Ligand binder design. Structure first.
Ligand SMILES: *[C@@H]1O[C@H](CO)[C@@H](O[C@@H]2O[C@H](CO)[C@@H](O[C@@H]3O[C@H](CO[C@H]4O[C@H](CO)[C@@H](O)[C@H](O)[C@@H]4O)[C@@H](O)[C@H](O[C@H]4O[C@H](CO)[C@@H](O)[C@H](O)[C@@H]4O[C@H]4O[C@H](CO)[C@@H](O)[C@H](O)[C@@H]4O)[C@@H]3O)[C@H](O)[C@H]2NC(C)=O)[C@H](O)[C@H]1NC(C)=O
Ligand SMILES: *[C@@H]1O[C@H](CO)[C@@H](O[C@@H]2O[C@H](CO)[C@@H](O)[C@H](O)[C@H]2NC(C)=O)[C@H](O)[C@H]1NC(C)=O
Ligand SMILES: *[C@@H]1O[C@H](CO)[C@@H](O[C@@H]2O[C@H](CO)[C@@H](O)[C@H](O)[C@H]2NC(C)=O)[C@H](O)[C@H]1NC(C)=O
Ligand SMILES: *[C@@H]1O[C@H](CO)[C@@H](O[C@@H]2O[C@H](CO)[C@@H](O)[C@H](O)[C@H]2NC(C)=O)[C@H](O)[C@H]1NC(C)=O
Ligand SMILES: *[C@@H]1O[C@H](CO)[C@@H](O[C@@H]2O[C@H](CO)[C@@H](O)[C@H](O)[C@H]2NC(C)=O)[C@H](O)[C@H]1NC(C)=O
Ligand code: NAG
Ligand code: NAG
Ligand code: NAG
Ligand code: CA
Ligand code: CA
Ligand code: CA
Ligand code: CA
Ligand code: CA
Ligand code: MG
Lengths: 593, 349
């Protein structure tokens, strides 16, 4: 609810280049600066004799939006013999998957056909370029000595990628072994040290991969999407991948042990042709130190009230428990044909409460099918199934739908305001957008002070200037505040002390603050973060009048906690957000005994 | 005006918190002019079964001389999307995927319309006799995209509004799904228009397949009655999807394929012996309640309606319109039938 849609940081690539197909963050702690990372799988390049190679443009955030393409590779097609090209880089969709560790970048090309060594062929094995600081390497474990449609010739390696926390690269090839799929894990500490620019089939000593299965598993598409997270308590991240056509197109999801690639747990869809496993994201959503699985089924068809079916999509939330079980819950989409559940990305702690958060996108939903992203918040139980914020795309479709929400990333604070951020890619209009999370303040409106209440039998202190036998009518207000991150000390929480907020205005109530010349009142307390409640005591008394509506009227007075945010905004211009969960008004009631 | 679905129109006024009702009667007619279309898979796997299309010309027209006033037939073929990794892109293999086996396979093609519906059975036999097979690599094949194209293009195929539109899809394997195209760089969703320019599906290679919901909507919009004729074990795959696709039938073709004319005729009889309805409501707050009154008196929930219907037999649908909240019309139609009832619901707030 705190992501700022008032000032989104914009970005733009070349027209028709699918800019924003894959997004990420670049945070090299050595240089202490923050960079985006956007892929453009249809971009033109400088490479000679290559048309539409692909670019990974590194875009800057610090007031300069200059997107400078990373020169992962500059050459053309290497050759086997005279007029016998070895590889075909044209239309290779490079940069369709961009992942960045603190000091590494891994961008892959899935549609990289090549002329196999044995015979003149065109096999879409795919390849990846791992840039590690200064050194740049090439990673292509699916172009090997044993390739064909039978083998991993059609591997399309690099369709999905991720980094393990222990310096490994998890790579997923959907098409190997007649489209059964494959996952491959290998450590960066060996990718760089084993790279001969004149060798194609490189054998990596400590690589882990999944092997061939029976012919009934064809067209399973294992590796269509990958993710990592510890799932058996060893501490090493475990490879979670989505296989969206297993079990007669029901969809399944596999989890493999991250130490030896041994199967641990399985999931399974419940509807045919629903794409269970299209998107997978493993986060810790309830804050119990156990990672929780999320699975997307964009094409799920859901029964309507009358019985008609609607294709709305569905996301499965599965909370890992300490004994090896999973408490699963469903979560359905909101608009028909919107493909809810296309993309899932953990957000970190978007509002700094203690439970990590998550966001799910519906690229073809929204008004005029521009796109919508939904923001979810964790709790001690689990996910909170009602979205707190709806993020909508602002761009019309030029030729194809804007697809706002196809890819997204979070969990890194780029403002360094303490809170994580979010970038979104609407690649159908060649754009990317950055959103900033505003700081959250908890106002604790107070209505308790000594003396607490009066039994009306005895006047503790009769107010001077009143002819009645009643005591003083204290209308003391307060507004306490506190925060977590970058916040100005002097909260200008402008308040009000309007008389009889539980009664009709426009008339003179039986109680009026005469010293204020009118019943109406106000406050301008400037609270401090961490201080005590700042009391603005007010005094009013009941006076005899010529005529009135009645002798007395019990109505409590509401103290406002409104802010301008104009001075609360820091240098970057990001106003603090006031937590909407806490009540906006508070007071105490008048009672006898 | 309407002859089979009565009443054909209803004007009713409702006020919030109230419920109305009426009776909708569907009386199937005696004989139906039938228009049948053979959307035939001609991939390399379906090679042994194309030759068994030479018998369906006169035999079926003899079988269906009593169930129909007149008869029409048509042809058309599909294999797959013609991009990698579904086809090979080698210059020798791209235009004949069979060349590594010395076959005269036809170039692959997303979908080609061959013969528009004609009552000349000799034309159908001639069109079928000259037909070749093609090839590709993947195990599944792109049938659903061809189904959508055949359902939507009306004046090209030659459907009749006065007929009982039927569509036979002859295959032996599971079909491609919507998001399977992401492997080929096709990330553009299908728009649901049809793009036959020279009786060839031009846009098979730029936009992805349709999903089950979009396919079903396009089928029911155009009153198409689909009859799958699957051969291998994948008949079961095509059968378990029937709940997700209203108004569709799945038959099994044995190894001998002598059971094709019978498959069509029994499927047509089962199709004609059923009535069910749905409602396309786009109004706010109005919820429709429909219970069907079978000739055996059953109180079915209507969404699947009453089966085992014949002529000399009128089926009645009990409706109940509600008015829950304030701010158009809704049309309730028997799926597969050519007439719809237009409930011009007036609303006053
Ligand atoms: C999550 O879900 C996945 C997918 O559903 C699941 O993975 C599957 O695991 C099973 C079991 O491990 C795999 O099936 C086979 O398992 C046998 C194990 O052998 C023993 O058990 C069987 C059970 O009946 C006995 O019959 C057998 O005699 C043994 O006691 C393996 O031997 C199989 O390997 C075969 O394939 C190899 C490669 O082709 C051959 O080299 C090998 O010799 C085996 O061939 C056999 O089958 C051939 C079929 O044509 C036949 O020709 C041979 O002569 C021989 O009979 C195979 O692994 C299944 O493949 C896995 N599927 C995938 C996609 O990985 C996970 O287990 C599950 N995990 C959890 C936690 O739920
Ligand atoms: C990258 O540049 C190439 C040309 O170098 C563009 O190729 C064009 O492709 C279209 C259709 O394929 C042709 O009609 C044009 O004639 C081609 N251009 C030229 C100069 O011949 C390609 O469109 C460019 N890519 C992007 C994303 O803009
Ligand atoms: C029905 O189609 C057949 C062809 O499939 C027509 O028969 C052809 O008639 C022409 C004369 O107009 C001859 O030159 C051809 O040799 C015939 N072909 C065959 C295979 O016999 C037939 O005329 C059509 N029916 C009608 C009523 O025109
Ligand atoms: C639905 O089908 C019926 C019969 O199949 C059609 O009724 C025919 O309509 C034509 C003119 O449209 C008449 O010449 C025939 O005499 C009618 N036949 C019968 C048996 O009534 C009806 O028109 C079709 N409705 C639509 C909307 O196409
Ligand atoms: C058709 O539906 C209407 C309701 O829309 C039925 O009318 C009800 O009939 C029962 C039976 O006596 C009464 O108790 C109710 O008061 C009637 N109205 C409602 C709103 O329920 C009617 O009976 C149905 N007809 C058939 C043949 O099923
Ligand atoms: C993989 O390692 C885990 C870790 O305990 C172990 O339980 C499992 O048996 C191992 N599998 C194989 C095949 O060695
Ligand atoms: C429809 O009618 C049935 C019984 O006829 C009733 O149980 C159900 O609640 C009704 N639903 C609506 C939406 O009116
Ligand atoms: C279907 O109708 C026929 C003729 O009315 C009847 O003989 C048959 O029993 C019916 N089927 C069922 C299941 O009742
Ligand atoms: Ca582990
Ligand atoms: Ca957990
Ligand atoms: Ca949180
Ligand atoms: Ca921030
Ligand atoms: Ca195919
Ligand atoms: Mg086939």
């Amino acid at each position: 609810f705190n992501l700022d849609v008032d000032s989104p940081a914009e970005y733009s690539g070349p027209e028709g280049s699918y800019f924003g197909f894959a997004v990420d963050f670049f945070v090299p702690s050595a240089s202490s600066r923050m960079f985006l990372l956007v892929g453009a799988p249809k971009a033109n390049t400088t490479q000679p004799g290559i048309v539409e190679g692909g670019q990974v443009l590194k875009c800057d955030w610090s007031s300069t939006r200059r997107c400078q393409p990373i020169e992962f590779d500059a050459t053309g097609n290497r050759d086997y013999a005279k007029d016998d090209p070895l590889e075909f880089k044209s239309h290779q969709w490079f940069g369709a998957s961009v992942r960045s560790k603190q000091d590494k970048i891994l961008a892959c090309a899935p549609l990289y056909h090549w002329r196999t060594e044995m015979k003149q062929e065109r096999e879409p094995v795919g390849t990846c370029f791992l840039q590690d600081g200064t050194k740049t390497v090439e990673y292509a474990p699916c172009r090997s000595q044993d390739i064909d449609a039978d083998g991993q010739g059609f591997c399309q390696g690099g369709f999905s990628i991720d980094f393990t926390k222990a310096d490994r690269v998890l790579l997923g090839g959907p098409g190997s072994f007649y489209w059964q799929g494959q996952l491959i894990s290998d450590q960066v500490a060996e990718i760089v040290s084993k790279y001969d620019p004149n060798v194609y089939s490189i054998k990596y000593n400590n690589q882990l991969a999944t092997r061939t299965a029976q012919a009934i598993f064809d067209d399973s598409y294992l590796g269509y999407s990958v993710a990592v997270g510890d799932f058996n308590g060893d501490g090493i991240d475990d490879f979670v991948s989505g296989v969206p056509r297993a079990a007669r197109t029901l969809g399944m999801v596999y989890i493999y042990d991250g130490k030896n690639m041994s199967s641990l747990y399985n999931f399974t869809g419940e509807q045919m042709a629903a794409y269970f496993g299209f998107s997978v994201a493993a986060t810790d959503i309830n804050g119990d130190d156990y990672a929780d699985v999320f699975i997307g089924a964009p094409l799920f068809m859901d029964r309507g009230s009358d019985g008609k079916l609607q294709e709305v999509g569905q996301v499965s939330v599965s909370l890992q428990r300490a004994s090896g079980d999973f408490q699963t819950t469903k979560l359905n989409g909101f608009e028909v044909f919107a493909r809810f559940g296309s993309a899932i990305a953990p957000l970190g702690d978007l509002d700094q409460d203690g439970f990590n958060d998550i966001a799910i996108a519906a690229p073809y939903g929204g008004e005029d099918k521009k796109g919508i992203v939904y923001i979810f918040n964790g709790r001690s139980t689990g996910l909170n199934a009602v979205p707190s914020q709806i993020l909508e795309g602002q761009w019309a479709a030029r030729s194809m739908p804007p697809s706002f929400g196809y890819s997204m990333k979070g969990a890194t604070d780029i403002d360094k305001n303490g809170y994580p951020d979010l970038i979104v890619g609407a690649f159908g209009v060649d754009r990317a957008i950055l959103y900033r999370a505003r700081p959250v303040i908890t106002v604790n409106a107070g209505l308790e002070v000594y003396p607490s209440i009066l039994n009306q039998d005895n006047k503790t202190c009769s107010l001077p200037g009143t002819a009645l036998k009643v005591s003083c009518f204290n209308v003391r207000f307060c507004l306490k505040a506190d925060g977590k991150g970058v916040l100005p000390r002097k909260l200008n929480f402008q308040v009000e002390l309007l008389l009889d907020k539980l009664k009709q205005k426009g008339a003179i109530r039986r109680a009026l603050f005469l010293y204020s010349r009118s019943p109406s009142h106000s406050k301008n307390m400037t609270i401090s973060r961490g201080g005590l409640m700042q009391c603005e005591e007010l005094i009013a008394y009941l006076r005899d009048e010529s005529e009135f509506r009645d002798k007395l009227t019990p109505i409590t007075i509401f103290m406002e906690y409104r802010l301008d945010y104009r001075t609360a905004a820091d240098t970057t211009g990001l106003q603090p957000i006031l937590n909407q969960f806490t009540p906006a008004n508070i007071s105490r009631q008048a009672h006898i005994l | 005006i309407n002859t089979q679905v009565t009443p054909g129109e209803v004007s009713i006024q409702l006020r919030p918190g109230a419920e109305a009702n009426f009776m909708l009667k569907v009386h199937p007619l005696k004989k139906y002019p039938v228009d049948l279309y053979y959307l035939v898979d001609v991939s390399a796997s379906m090679h042994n079964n194309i030759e068994k299309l030479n018998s369906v010309g006169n035999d079926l027209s003899r079988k269906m001389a009593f169930f129909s006033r007149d008869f029409r037939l048509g042809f058309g073929s599909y294999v797959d999307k013609t991009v990698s990794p579904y086809i090979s892109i080698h210059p020798e293999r791209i235009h004949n995927q069979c060349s590594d086996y010395n076959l005269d396979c036809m170039p692959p093609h997303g979908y080609i319309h061959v013969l528009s519906l004609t009552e000349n059975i000799t034309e159908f036999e001639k069109a079928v006799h000259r037909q070749k097979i093609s090839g590709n690599i993947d195990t599944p094949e792109g049938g659903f995209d061809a189904m959508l194209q055949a359902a939507v293009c009306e004046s090209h195929i030659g459907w009749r509004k006065e007929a009982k539109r039927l569509l036979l899809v002859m295959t032996d394997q599971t079909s491609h799904l919507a998001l399977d195209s992401k492997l080929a760089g096709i990330v553009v969703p299908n728009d649901g228009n049809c793009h036959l320019k020279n009786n060839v599906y031009v846009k098979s290679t730029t936009m992805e397949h349709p999903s089950l919901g979009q396919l079903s909507e396009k089928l029911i919009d155009n009153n198409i009655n689909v009859i799958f004729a699957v051969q291998g074990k994948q008949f079961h795959w095509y059968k378990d999807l029937l709940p997700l696709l209203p108004g569709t039938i799945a038959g099994e073709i044995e190894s001998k394929a002598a059971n094709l004319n019978n498959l069509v005729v029994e499927a047509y009889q089962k199709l004609i012996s059923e009535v069910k309805v749905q409602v396309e409501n786009q109004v706010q707050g109005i919820y429709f309640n429909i219970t069907a009154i079978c000739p055996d008196g059953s109180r079915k929930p209507g969404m699947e309606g009453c089966r085992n219907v014949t002529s000399n037999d009128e089926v009645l649908f009990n409706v109940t319109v509600t008015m829950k909240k304030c701010d158009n019309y809704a049309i309730i139609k028997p799926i597969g039938f050519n007439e719809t009832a237009k409930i011009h619901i007036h609303r006053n707030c």
